[PDB]
Every structure is written in structure tokens, then in C-alpha cells.
Amino acid sequence: RGGFAWDILGIQNNKKPKSGLYKSERGNFDLDTLNSTVSVAPGTSIIAFDVIEQSMPIGLITWIGWGTSGITEFYINVYRCVDDRSDPELGELIHQSENIAGLLAGSASPGANMAYELTTPIEAVAGDLLAYEFIAVGGTHTMRGRDFNLPDNDGAPIGNVGATRSLSTPSLPPATLDKADVTWTDNVPRVGIAVDTGTGSDHHDP
Amino acid sequence: AVGGVLGGGSIEETIKRIVDAIVSGIVGVTGIGAGISDLQSLIEQISSAAARGGFAWDILGIQNNKKPKSGLYKSERGNFDLDTLNSTVSVAPGTSIIAFDVI
Amino acid sequence: LAGSASPGANMAYELTTPIEAVAGDLLAYEFIAVGGTHTMRGRDFNLPDND
Amino acid sequence: EQSMPIGLITWIGWGTSGITEFYINVYRCVDDRSDPELGELIHQSENIAGL
16 A cells, blocks of 8 residues: 555646646646736846645746747756755756757747757756746747735745846856845746656656 | 474474465465565565655655745645735624635 | 735734644634724635535 | 546536536546547436536
8 A cells, every 4th residue: 555655646647737738747836827927138037936846857848928039049047946045045056958049939918838858857856946047138038927916025935936137147047046146026937847748757666 | 293383283384384374464365385585575575565655654744845826935835825816805893704724 | 913004914923832733624714803904815706605 | 636436526607598408528538649539438417407
């Protein structure tokens, strides 16, 4: 019975369509709460926090958006956060993308589904607070999101449901980010994460 | 020639009964003709499944893996998610208000 | 309680001793006040009563 | 999300004129896109019009 209990905890392909149409896609939030939009204007970047509920190899990041014009050197960055408010660091870098500017689509309010396969997966454990960063140069891209009207928090590990950085150097993300060099924010993009494009990749021990 | 123990007529019957009983508890069907190689093999399979039951219980004991959309504190849960908030209700004199939740 | 009337402030209450909630338990949280009208963020559902 | 015996199906709705029959059907879907098939019929209801 313990062996079967451990196998049920290893099902990755049991996530509801409201969270992402792929079998294994999680959201930072679900598609059913979408309300309005956020935009990636050069010299600023939008940061979305999430907590990994179940350990997984993250292999496919996804979002809904529009604005496949003016862009060169679009980048995704991922970093792993400090568990405590009081610490002067916010988090340590885990992933840099290559330039993904060619992957982008969409020209109207319904947007387009778009995706990024990590050329090697990232191992995230249960309870891990990740931060997803979106960066672009030339024009501005747009992402479906939530007008997430909330008060800033003075005690919890993260000050508000996302953040934004006034970044100077889009070609080079810091190895580390501080509590000080980032600003807490309400309007956040939906960020999706999946194991891979297809059914399978549930672990089943021999 | 040596008299047995625990029901065995001989020490050969005693040891065979002990080994056959352990293997019959692991495999579930009562049987005979087990060896000490079965004893090691089948105890290694239980030990592995039991250790995985321990790891399963550890995962079910994580309190600290709730998304910030449910509350910014790493343990917070709540009766609704923050991304479905709309409008308000007022706690006011003479009429208290009740929120239900399931744990 | 939070010293503003803007659209939100974060309020918190540590129990002097925890309460032992159990899986599948159904709990009710009641809120009471005197001398004013505390406004809580919530949801209006437009939901019918179930019998 | 979790294995269960499905036993009761719910909705919130309105409409009670003209309708001579209502049917709910349940299908088990193929776990892939690129094959020709959507899914296999699990369940056909009796006429649900009384509900």
C-alpha cells in the first residue's frame, strides 16, 4: 500500500484543463481568473512568482500573448528564491534562455498560445518558490494576466503576487537578485509549466 | 536425529518451517520449498516498498507548498483564492457573518 | 485592525494555542464587531441555496 | 485528479418548457491529438427530463 501511495504522488498527467490544456501543465494561476493584460516595455521586466506543489522536471514553459513586432532578443530567465523576507537576497539564478524572439505570435486580444522547451529540464522540488522573468528589446510584447488588486505585505516571504525590475542589461541577467533591486506589483502574467508536450513521463518505480 | 522446536519433529523440520513461514507471509499463499536466497530477495522487496511508504508520508506532511495566489505566506490556504476576489461584505453590529471551509 | 479605508490592508491573527483541524473537517469562521462596520474583501456568488 | 466512483453529476441552470427529453452522455477520451479518435462512450443516460 505504501508503494502504491508513492506512485499516486508521482502522477504528473492529472492536471485539469482550466490550468492549461496540456495534460501536465500547472499555472502560477488558472486560466479561469484571467482579467486584463500586462506588457513587456524595454528597460523594465515582469517577474511572476510561483510555489511548486509537487516535485517535477520543468521542461515546457507556456503563456498566452500578442505583439510579434519590433522584437529582437526576447529572453526568459528563471531564478530560485530565498525562504525568508529578512535576508538581503531575493534569489539565485537557475535558467537563462537563448534568444527566443522567433517563437512569438498573435496580433489581437485573444492572443496566441506560445511555448518554450528547456534544452535541458530544471529540477524543482515541492515547496520551491520560483520566480519567472520576462525580457524583450524593440517594441513591447503583451501577455494575458490578472489585474490582481491587493495590498503589499510587510511579513510574508514575497511582498505581493509578482514583481518588476528596472533592468539595464537585457543580455546579462544577474547571478543573484536582492530584496532591494526589484519592486513588488499587482498586475501579473499567467505563467504555465509542464513536464513535456505529451502523455507519459509519470514516474513508476520498477 | 536432533529433536525440533515450535512444532518441528526435528531441527530440519524446525528451520524449514521458520523459513517457509516468512516466505509464505511475504508471498501470501502458504507454501513449501523456500531457500535463504528467497529470504533475502523477498525481504529486500518489502524493505523498498516500506521505505517508499515513508517517502509518501513525508510528502503528505508538507504544510509549506501552497501557491501565493492562495495567500502570500508559504503555509496559507483560505476558503477562496485571491484571484476570485470581487466586491465586499461588512462585519457590522448585531449581525455577525460566517464563512465555511473544508480542511 | 488596519488604520485605512482604501481597497485593502493585510490583517493577521496568531492563535495563542493552535487548533487541531483534520482532513475532511468542516469549519465555520465567525466575525463580530461593535461601534463600526469593518469591510472585508469577498465574493458575491449569485448562488442558489442547496437543500 | 484522484480515482473515484463517479456517482452524482451536478449543474446550476434554468429552463423548463418544451423539452421532451434531456440526455447526458459521458465519454473516455484518447490521450493524444494526432490520432483520428476523440473518445469512447462510457455512459448513456435514461431520459433526464424529470430533473
